[PDB]
Design a protein around this nucleic acid. Sequence first.
RNA 1: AAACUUUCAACAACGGAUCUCUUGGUUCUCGCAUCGAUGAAGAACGCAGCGAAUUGCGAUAUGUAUUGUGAAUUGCAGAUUUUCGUGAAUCAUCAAAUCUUUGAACGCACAUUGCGCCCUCUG
RNA 2: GGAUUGUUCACCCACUAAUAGGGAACGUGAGCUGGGUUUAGACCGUCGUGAGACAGGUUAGUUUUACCCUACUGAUGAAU
RNA 3: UAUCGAUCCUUUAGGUCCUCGGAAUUUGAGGCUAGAGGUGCCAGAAAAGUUACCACAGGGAUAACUGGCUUGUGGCAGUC
RNA 4: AGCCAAAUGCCUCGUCAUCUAAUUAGUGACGCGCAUGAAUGGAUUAACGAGAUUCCCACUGUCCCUAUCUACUAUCUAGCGAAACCACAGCCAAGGGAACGGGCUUGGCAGAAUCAGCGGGGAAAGAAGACCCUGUUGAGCUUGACUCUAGUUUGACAUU
RNA 5: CGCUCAAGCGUGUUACCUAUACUCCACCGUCAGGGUUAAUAUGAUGCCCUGACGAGUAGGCAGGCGUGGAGGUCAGUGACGAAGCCUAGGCUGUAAAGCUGGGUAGAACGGCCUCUAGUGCAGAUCUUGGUGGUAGUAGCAAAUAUUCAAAUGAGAACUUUGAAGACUGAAGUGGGGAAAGGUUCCACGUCAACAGCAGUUGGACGUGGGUUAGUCGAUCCUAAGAGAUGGGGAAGCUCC
RNA 6: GUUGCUUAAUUGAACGUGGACAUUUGAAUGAAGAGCUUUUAGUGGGCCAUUUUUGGUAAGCAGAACUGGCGAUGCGGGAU
RNA 7: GAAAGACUAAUCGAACCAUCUAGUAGCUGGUUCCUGCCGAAGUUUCCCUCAGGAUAGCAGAAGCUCGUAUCAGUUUUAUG
RNA 8: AGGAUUGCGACUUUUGUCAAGGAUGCUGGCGUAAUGGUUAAAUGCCGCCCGUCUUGAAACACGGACCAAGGAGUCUAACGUCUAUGCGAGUGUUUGGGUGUAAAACCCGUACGCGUAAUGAAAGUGAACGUAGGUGAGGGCCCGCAAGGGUGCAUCAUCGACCGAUCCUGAUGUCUUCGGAUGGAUUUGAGUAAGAGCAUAGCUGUUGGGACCCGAAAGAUGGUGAACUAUGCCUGAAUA
RNA 9: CUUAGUAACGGCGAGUGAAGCGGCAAAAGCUCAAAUUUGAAAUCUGGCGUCUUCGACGUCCGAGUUGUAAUUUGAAGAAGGCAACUUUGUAGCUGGUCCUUGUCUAUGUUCCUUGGAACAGGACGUCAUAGAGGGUGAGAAUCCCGUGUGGCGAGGAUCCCAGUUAUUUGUAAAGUGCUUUCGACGAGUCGAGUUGUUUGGGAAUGCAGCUCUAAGUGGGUGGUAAAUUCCAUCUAAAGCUAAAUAUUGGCGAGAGACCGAUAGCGAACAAGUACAGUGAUGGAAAGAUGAAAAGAACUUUGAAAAGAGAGUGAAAAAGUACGUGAAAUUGUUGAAAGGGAAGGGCAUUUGAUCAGACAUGGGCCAGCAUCAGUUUUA
Lengths: 197, 147
Amino acid sequence: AISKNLPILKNHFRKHWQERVKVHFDQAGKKVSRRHARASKAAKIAPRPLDLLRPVVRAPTVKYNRKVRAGRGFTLAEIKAAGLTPAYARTIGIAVDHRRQNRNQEILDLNIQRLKEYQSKIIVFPRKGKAPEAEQTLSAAASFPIVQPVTDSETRAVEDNGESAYRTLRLARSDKRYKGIREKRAKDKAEAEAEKK
Amino acid sequence: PTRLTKTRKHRGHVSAGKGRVGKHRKHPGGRGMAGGLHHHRTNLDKYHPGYFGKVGMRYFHKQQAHFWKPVLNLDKLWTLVPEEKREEYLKSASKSAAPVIDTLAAGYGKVLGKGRIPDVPVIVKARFVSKLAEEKIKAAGGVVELI
RNA sequence: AAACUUUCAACAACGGAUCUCUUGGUUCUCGCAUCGAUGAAGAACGCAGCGAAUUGCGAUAUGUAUUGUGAAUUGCAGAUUUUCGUGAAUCAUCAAAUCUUUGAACGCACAUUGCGCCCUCUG
RNA sequence: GGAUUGUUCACCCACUAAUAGGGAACGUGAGCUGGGUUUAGACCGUCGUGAGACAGGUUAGUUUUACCCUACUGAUGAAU
RNA sequence: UAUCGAUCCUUUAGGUCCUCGGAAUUUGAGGCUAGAGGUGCCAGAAAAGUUACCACAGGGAUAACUGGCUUGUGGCAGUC
RNA sequence: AGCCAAAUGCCUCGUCAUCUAAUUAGUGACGCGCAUGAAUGGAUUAACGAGAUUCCCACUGUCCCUAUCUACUAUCUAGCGAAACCACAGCCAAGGGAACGGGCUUGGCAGAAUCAGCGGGGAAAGAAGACCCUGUUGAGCUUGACUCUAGUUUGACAUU
RNA sequence: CGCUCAAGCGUGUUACCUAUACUCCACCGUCAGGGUUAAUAUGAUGCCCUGACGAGUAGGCAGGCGUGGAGGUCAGUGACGAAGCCUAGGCUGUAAAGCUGGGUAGAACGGCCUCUAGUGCAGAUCUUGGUGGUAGUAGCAAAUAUUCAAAUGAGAACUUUGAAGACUGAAGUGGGGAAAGGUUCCACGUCAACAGCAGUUGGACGUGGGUUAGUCGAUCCUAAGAGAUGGGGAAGCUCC
RNA sequence: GUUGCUUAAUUGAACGUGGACAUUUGAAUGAAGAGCUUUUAGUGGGCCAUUUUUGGUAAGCAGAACUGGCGAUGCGGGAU
RNA sequence: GAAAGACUAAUCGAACCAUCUAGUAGCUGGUUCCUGCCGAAGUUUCCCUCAGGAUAGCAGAAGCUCGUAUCAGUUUUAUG
RNA sequence: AGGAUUGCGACUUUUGUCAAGGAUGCUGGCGUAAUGGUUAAAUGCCGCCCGUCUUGAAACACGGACCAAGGAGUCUAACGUCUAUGCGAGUGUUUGGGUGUAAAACCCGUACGCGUAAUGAAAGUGAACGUAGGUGAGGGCCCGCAAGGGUGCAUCAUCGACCGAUCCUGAUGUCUUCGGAUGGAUUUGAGUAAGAGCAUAGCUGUUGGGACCCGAAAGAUGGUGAACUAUGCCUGAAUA
RNA sequence: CUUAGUAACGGCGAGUGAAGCGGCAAAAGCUCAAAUUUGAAAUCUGGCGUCUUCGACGUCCGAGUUGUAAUUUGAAGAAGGCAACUUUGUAGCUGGUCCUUGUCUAUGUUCCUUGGAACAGGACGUCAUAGAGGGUGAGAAUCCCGUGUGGCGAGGAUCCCAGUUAUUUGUAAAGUGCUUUCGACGAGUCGAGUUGUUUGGGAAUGCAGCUCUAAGUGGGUGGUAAAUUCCAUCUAAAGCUAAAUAUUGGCGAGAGACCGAUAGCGAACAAGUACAGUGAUGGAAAGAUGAAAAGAACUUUGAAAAGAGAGUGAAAAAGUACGUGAAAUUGUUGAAAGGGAAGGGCAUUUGAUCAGACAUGGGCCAGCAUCAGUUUUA
């Protein structure tokens, strides 16, 4: 119990931990089961890709707002903008999400381009007779990748105007702290007591 | 390796490196940090301090996300620009053609002063900035854009 | 001096270590989802030419029919000739049947092979 | 040699030449005895609110094994 | 040259202070800096008995019986 | 009111009387009784008691003081045939030593193999002391120890 | 032990005995300070030179010996005899140990470079199994008791028949049942073990045979009790 | 020379710039290399001797002071 | 339970059978091959501490920066 | 002891000789059980029975009749110092995907962990007066025939500068109460001052885990027993 | 996989301890109630009959208007008007596909030595998309079964695909542009107080009992109790649903730097067996003759068991008390010693026994002389 000059550890092993241990021996064997499953599914489905075509989406929070990422579904506004119904789109390999909204013109355009690029490149076989087969492309993500938007001009002018970026932050932060009391100090003095006059 | 250990070497002797008087019993002191205030005070007065007690105030539902802001010294600054475009830029940029350095794309919050950069116009983009960091950039020629 | 006591060696005892073997264990991985009132799991009592146990089966009792293979079974008998075959076998297979007395156990009881009631054919 | 006491000690009645004092794992329990102390039953007094206590008194309460070695007491006996 | 006291909790003093994380205003609670409420087992658990009906782990680091060292005390003998 | 050195009295073997040659006992009186005493029952008492205690008659090997007899063992043989215990073994005196040696030290000494007995030693066997102290080990019982609790009782709201 | 102008007591003066101590030499190890492939065969981790030191429980570090498996390598050894086991034979190492002659026996096993571990025993009132002294000893003594011939048999203190003595003495060593056992009852064969001596005998061992009910019992009725159903509890096993 | 210290001050006090004096490195003896850092074992019941010494009649009793031993240690002598 | 803490399947001051359970122990006993080098401690402060731990002291191992240094369980002169 | 020669010397008229940096010369016997080796007994002197707890054991202290096999610091999750290896302001393929002679070997990259910045309770702010500063020591190199001078990494001591907190001071301006310029202080930090870490592996040490091995009196959950014995009820029997 | 041994909790002691975003594996969505078919209960169970029988068609009672069909589910959606139209459906037959299976498809038993036996050693070949493993009298690619490569059958599953043939759905079902009016949404519930329990959840995270009990731009949440004013987000009190994830049980296949009969499961054998307890339960030991039983005919001693011979076999030093057969412990023979134990260390002597370069042509043990190093004695 304690005493040399060592760091104070925190080992949580006072319950029956040995009864509930897992060792992943299956890692190597379980990989082959998934490769077999992905292969056998493609044999059943045949000429279609395994993946549904997903849209481009911006991430949340201060930490990840500077990067784009593949979302869940295309929304109802963007599916209409291209020129097709939501019920029809589900059977062509296009994911739909009824709850995502649009408050950005940049993301709205990108995904309309993504649908028009998809609709042009895919072919559709009729229900009746002839079916001219053209192999299978497995991954939809390979043919339709996700690229980061560029907001860059490598060489550019140097327009200074003696404002000071540091001084701008100190003034802007001070306004948020004091607008509460500064509104109420204006609601007295100038208003209430002087509106009575 | 089981052969290299010292328990192989102790075969023959009685105590096996534990003494005849001390005996090596189960738990003579306690079981993990036991008697910190009573009979292991001399250990904790030395070596550790500040162990018992509680300074400060609580934060309920704290997230490692609001508190981000990874710093960047002015020593590093030019490392964000590519290696090919460097010997070109260091020798004559001279305004109307300065290399734009977006710090947030690389993954940095606050541009921060430490090193002594060369006299070339820069035009940096960053969320936050130090007071000294701005003085060094304006001495060179460039400016700082906020985001 | 012998006997007796103690130590050694050769041969003989006592006992089953050592060494070599192995139709069994233990761990890990991979696949599949199928008990029962149409009477299950379990239990008793029986059945082989000569068996006590184990292994199989239920008075059709170490099994019958159906399909396949193509001549055995074997401790000792004994056949059957079935041996250019609609066929030997403790073979493999298994989709039709039999399935004593019980048991969730069901006419009422049950330290009892106890005691009743209804329909139907024969004395 | 006896009376009384579980007694060591003590105190008496006699006899006698005389009734000196001590040791030996406070000799001696696989030699005996079990009255005493010393478990559980039970009673009395003082003390304790109570369970219980008492270097107070009282009564009933289990004494195992030698065939071995030496020791001692007797008994045979190889070899000059 | 002696005359006194941690953590945690409560409480008082101080500041044109900081926080209640969707944004404000007042009450309210939480913090930052120094005092007080006490641990006398005084480097700081919150705590009554009894066992002769007893139990386990140990101890000759430790009592009740001999033995050994010692002789105040007990007993026996000298000296003037 | 009663009763007593009583199964209740420390000081004690109380003092006086009686039983004996002689009585820390027994019985009868005395009582400022350490600490007797009235249904936590006091005093008395016929019958009954494998209850405790003292004395007298008869009786006797309890004793002075031991002796003898009978069966069944032991003893010897034929057959059958174990256990406890065991570091190694088994002659003494003194010395020193973990203060009481069968082995060390100095002396005494010392002769194969064995059979009946016996209880002096082997600090002889039996059982990780029950007495005593320690352990931050327990359990049984008790209580104005500390913190709880079933049951019960009082009040409010619902059933109304 | 013995000693008396000592082998006693006090004092002096010489010789002599003797420790793993001291001096000197041989060899071992450890540590330090140097010198050297300048082609100059064999280990630069080599091959030499010089100087000092050596006790040791608890403890720490270093360098080696052996056991069971794994990767490599000696085109390793072997039915012309591998492993194991026995040996008052031999050789090497300070030692842990290794190599090898003779015997026994009949299928696998070694060295060198590395990996890896359920890797080395004299003790634990250790665990399981086996065997000693003690010892041909303790002992096989309660229920009054045996004896003589004849037969069978390899064999008779103990079996079968005869004769003589005895006991239990009808609240019994007599005649029948209940609980409980379960073939022990009965015949023919027969003694390896069991019947703490023996055995031709046996409640032993091997192979068969044997229990016949309208009237005797069970079945039927209720006793102290037990216990479904209708109901009400309980999360429920189930409780009343 | 230096300054916000200190002085009646052009003084003082600290830290300096340049300068003079190395046989005779300004007592003895020795030096086994000197200084320093990290990390972790066992141990935390002690005891005896020569002097100093407290309690006690005294003890192979209890308790301190300074060096040396035993514990951890054989070997020659004190018979042991 | 006509009361002894009696009896309750050789088990009673709280039966027996399995499981949690390899319960916990500052306390007892044991702890498996050779040579080579170095080599202790029973003391200070705190603790429901006195048969136990922490902390310093003593010990080993790994070494790093340097190469006769400003050192010595010692002496002398001067001076407290 | 050593194993060509080398050195210091001596005696020599000289060549040479020699007791001078460790023994050569001459002779005899036997050539094997004679010398040696192991083994058994005898004789002289010496030697108490191991293991263990203890200030102290041959102990009248504990365990040990004897033999064979089994039998006790292991593995893991976080870690510390030291050491080897790879890359080095970076480092880490193996959650997962691609491939395959199929649990192997080989290949791929978004993230993410640690490191590159600290200090405050927080709101927050956030590291160059000067050759990244002076003084004292410093290996090594440079100049010199030397004496001595120059340049001085690592590190150690020491006084300053810079960033954060703390306590004062409070400039131009300005929503008239915000804002914080510049200058300071016997305070204060696990800071800056031409970056050192990350990953794998190894001995030793730490904490949780059965945790080196065996060992309690207890406690809790769920079950089985009134054939012994305690007591009551129903129904029978027994006593000269 | 990270977040993280972190934010919080805790005699703030010991100790406990999540979740959001980010990167991956896998991705699939949907149904009722609340509206009048009201110009036609349009719907469904059973009975009886007939067929191509997991069903379909027709007919007769019943269920039900206190609500069974169609129509709509908040992503919407409906009722009207105006306007262009793009789509369609239900059986069996053969083949592939997926399972359960059966059979076919290379090469030496040539010569010599050892042996009881070649599967050993040596010489000369052969096959290889087959040199994995096992069997046969000793280590077999080539003796046998297999293994490798590929053919050829049979018997199920069937909608998963492909290709066909009947049919025969239709004037009915679905989708979309514009414009007007509406747009039904779950109550002893939400929410509040209080008690007990639980969480990291702190003036209370969820759950349950009890008392109180709503609303229509309403109600919930926004991790500090309130009152006041805004904003962002979802729509509770009804319901269905594959995949990635688990698995000391069951049925079927692969492997191992794992154990090798005191080990490994309690159990390699007639093991939950023999045996113990009234009962719940408790619970062992025990593997190996030889290639082949060829398991010892026949003589002779004995009442018999057995013994001596003989005989089998490579061996009976393999005899069913059986491969090898260690130690304690015992018998016989041989050698040695022995006056109250034995057993050790140093050094000799005697007795036993044993290694080691005198063989070519036919080393061991001493003595004397002159020297060196260290000493002793006149």
